[PDB]
Amino acid sequence: DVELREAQRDYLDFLDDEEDQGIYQSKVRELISDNQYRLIVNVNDLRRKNEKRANRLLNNAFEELVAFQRALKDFVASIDATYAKQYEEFYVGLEGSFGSKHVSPRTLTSCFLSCVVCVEGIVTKCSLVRPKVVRSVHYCPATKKTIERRYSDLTSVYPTKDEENNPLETEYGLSVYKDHQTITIQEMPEKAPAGQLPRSVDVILDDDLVDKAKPGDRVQVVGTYRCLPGKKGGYTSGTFRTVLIACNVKQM
Amino acid sequence: ELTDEDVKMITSLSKDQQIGEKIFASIAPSIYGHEDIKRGLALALFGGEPKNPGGKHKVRGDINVLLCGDPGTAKSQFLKYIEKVSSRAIFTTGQGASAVGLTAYVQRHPVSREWTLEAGALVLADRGVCLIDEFDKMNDQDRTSIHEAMEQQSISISKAGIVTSLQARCTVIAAANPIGGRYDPSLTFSENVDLTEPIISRFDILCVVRDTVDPVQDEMLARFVVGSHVRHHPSNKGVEPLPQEVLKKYIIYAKERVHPKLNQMDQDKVAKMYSDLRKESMATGSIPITVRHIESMIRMAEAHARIHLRDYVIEDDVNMAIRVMLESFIDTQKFSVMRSMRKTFARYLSFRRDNNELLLFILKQLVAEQVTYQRN
Ligand SMILES: Nc1ncnc2c1ncn2[C@@H]1O[C@H](COP(=O)(O)OP(=O)(O)OP(=O)(O)O)[C@@H](O)[C@H]1O
Numbered sequence: 001d002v003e004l005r006e007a008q009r010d011y012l013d014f015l016d017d018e019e020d021q022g023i024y025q026s027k028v029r030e031l032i033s034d035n036q037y038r039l040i041v042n043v044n045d046l047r048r049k050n051e052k053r054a055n056r057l058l059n060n061a062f063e064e065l066v067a068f069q070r071a072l073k074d075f076v077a078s079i080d081a082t083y084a085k086q087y088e089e090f091y092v093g094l095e096g097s098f099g100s101k102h103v104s105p106r107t108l109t110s111c112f113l114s115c116v117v118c119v120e121g122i123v124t125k126c127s128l129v130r131p132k133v134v135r136s137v138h139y140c141p142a143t144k145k146t147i148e149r150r151y152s153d154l155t156s157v158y159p160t161k162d163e164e165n166n167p168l169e170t171e172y173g174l175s176v177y178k179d180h181q182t183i184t185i186q187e188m189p190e191k192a193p194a195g196q197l198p199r200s201v202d203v204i205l206d207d208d209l210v211d212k213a214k215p216g217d218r219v220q221v222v223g224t225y226r227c228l229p230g231k232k233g234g235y236t237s238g239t240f241r242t243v244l245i246a247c248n249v250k251q252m
Numbered sequence: 253e254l255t256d257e258d259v260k261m262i263t264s265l266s267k268d269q270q271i272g273e274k275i276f277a278s279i280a281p282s283i284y285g286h287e288d289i290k291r292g293l294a295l296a297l298f299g300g301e302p303k304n305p306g307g308k309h310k311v312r313g314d315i316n317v318l319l320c321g322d323p324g325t326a327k328s329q330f331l332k333y334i335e336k337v338s339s340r341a342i343f344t345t346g347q348g349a350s351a352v353g354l355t356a357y358v359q360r361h362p363v364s365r366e367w368t369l370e371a372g373a374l375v376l377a378d379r380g381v382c383l384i385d386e387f388d389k390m391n392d393q394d395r396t397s398i399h400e401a402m403e404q405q406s407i408s409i410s411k412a413g414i415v416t417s418l419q420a421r422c423t424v425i426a427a428a429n430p431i432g433g434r435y436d437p438s439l440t441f442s443e444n445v446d447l448t449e450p451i452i453s454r455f456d457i458l459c460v461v462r463d464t465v466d467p468v469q470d471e472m473l474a475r476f477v478v479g480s481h482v483r484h485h486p487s488n489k490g491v492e493p494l495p496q497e498v499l500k501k502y503i504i505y506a507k508e509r510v511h512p513k514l515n516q517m518d519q520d521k522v523a524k525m526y527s528d529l530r531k532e533s534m535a536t537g538s539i540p541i542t543v544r545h546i547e548s549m550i551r552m553a554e555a556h557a558r559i560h561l562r563d564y565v566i567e568d569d570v571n572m573a574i575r576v577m578l579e580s581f582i583d584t585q586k587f588s589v590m591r592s593m594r595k596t597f598a599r600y601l602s603f604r605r606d607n608n609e610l611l612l613f614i615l616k617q618l619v620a621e622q623v624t625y626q627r628n
Pocket residue numbers: 282283284285286322323324325326327328329428429473476477
């Protein structure tokens with residue numbers, strides 16, 4: 001993929017901040033020193049250094065964020081491979097000045113799907129934190145075999161019988177889970193028009209963000225807006241359920 | 253009810269030159285007496301002329317009526333007759349015993365299961381008549397809603413998400429009982445009724461129905477009701493009142509076509525009358541006369557002209573409207589002020605009141621005084 005390689009190279013060059021003011025090199029040193037695996041990057045820096053990269057990141061959030069995270073992992077490996085080996089993936093959060101993407105749940109129209117949005121709102125729902133499995137390990141007493149099965153982020157089959165029908169006992173401890181939560185955010189009553197009912201939107205929080213925001217707090221969520229699918233079925237209505245896959249949650 | 257050649261019929265008796273008495277006697281024919289109340293209800297039915305000079309001075313063309321009286325006097329009968337005879341007329345009670353309430357709201361209709369905006373009763377009578385029985389037993393919110401409707405001729409809803417303002421240009425005909433179940437003339441009207449001053453200030457006619465012991469009237473009413481009972485048994489199932497269907501045809505035609513203009517009103521007479529009433533009312537510790545009384549007199553004069561389809565208010569129309577307005581205003585006063593204003597303005601209050609009526613009233617007063625002296 002020439003496009004993905006170019007994106008990753010540009011992102012890595014940006015993160016390679018030694019000739020410049022050394023801001024993001026210091027930020028990576030910070031994240032490694034304090035033992036966290038998520039980086040916060042100001043979009044204004046992307047605009048100042050490469051407008052094309054910033055526009056691509058904002059308008060096509062998913063693949064651009066994947067490339068940015070892979071470049072981040074490569075850079076942290078270069079600065080330190082010992083720490084980089086500890087975490088399977090290095091995540092990224094965004095912030096700054098989102099020109100037209102900065103909206104509220106009311107203004108959040110379908111035009112922003114697959115884009116980067118920095119919404120501001122009042123938190124209404126915070127669901128219980130659940131561990132979503134990402135990698136299961138199953139041990140067969142009969143065959144002495146340990147089988148690992150991955151679970152890609154498709155936001156399904158859980159093996160229980162061996163090849164010749166030997167029961168598999170899942171290895172919870174060796175299995176890998178990521179904590180996950182869903183919150184519902186609402187437009188601030190102050191800025192909402194006085195007449196009609198409040199307009200809200202969902203937000204999905206992965207690890208490092210499951211409890212960053214509590215119910216009834218004014219927050220700013222930066223993330224990707226996409227459509228959820230229905231379950232398997234012959235017939236479907238054109239309707240789609242949309243959520244905001246957060247890349248960063250900040251207290252206003 | 254869109255007929256033709258009945259314009260000839262309506263005009264045929266419109267020139268009778270005494271149709272006013274006929275129509276005033278053709279209201280609720282099942283109710284004996286209460287002629288003044290019937291006149292007031294006729295004027296309310298025909299209504300005034302709504303006018304909004306420029307767009308900043310909204311003046312209602314309606315004639316709201318309030319019948320306050322001790323029980324057993326057929327007030328609810330008048331309200332039910334108006335319900336029966338006037339199109340777009342709805343009936344509601346201060347209690348919750350009415351099908352539709354005074355206040356707007358939104359909900360899923362119990363039978364249709366559909367989410368609808370239940371507009372208040374006043375709105376349903378947008379261009380008709382709203383009859384309010386038990387006017388003195390409403391809720392706080394009901395009182396607020398009636399106040400809003402009577403003041404600004406519209407209702408503002410912000411219940412669920414519906415920030416709207418829908419207009420209710422209704423004529424309110426209300427019935428009520430005095431505080432304590434009996435009207436005491438020694439107290440002014442505004443204090444022996446469980447209604448705040450702003451509410452009463454928006455009614456154009458106040459009818460004080462009093463049940464005073466009188467052998468002749470008692471015998472007459474007994475004969476009336478007992479004859480009704482006789483004639484409606486299951487086995488057997490000074491002008492001439494108009495038939496009810498023709499009466500409502502006349503009401504429709506007048507209320508839809510003729511729009512009298514008061515280009516012939518004698519401003520001199522009205523101004524002198526108003527100044528005299530102001531001076532007299534303030535000379536005593538009594539409720540004064542205000543501009544809204546002149547407004548109500550104008551509306552009633554226009555309505556009386558509409559009854560006769562004159563298209564131009566005439567001196568007699570103005571005099572009759574003044575008679576009605578002064579009768580209401582005087583009867584709202586306390587006992588002493590009642591006689592004060594009666595004697596001071598007897599000339600105005602006697603318009604179109606022949607000698608026989610006044611003489612009979614005076615003879616009845618004298619004989620009642622004699623009876624009281626006898627039986628004490
Ligand atoms: N002037 C009248 N002419 C004919 N019938 C009358 C008259 N006054 C009272 N009645 C009769 O007497 C009864 C009492 O009248 P009604 O029930 O209408 O009372 P009301 O004035 O509405 O009292 P309340 O304030 O208690 O509701 C009725 O059957 C009514 O027909």
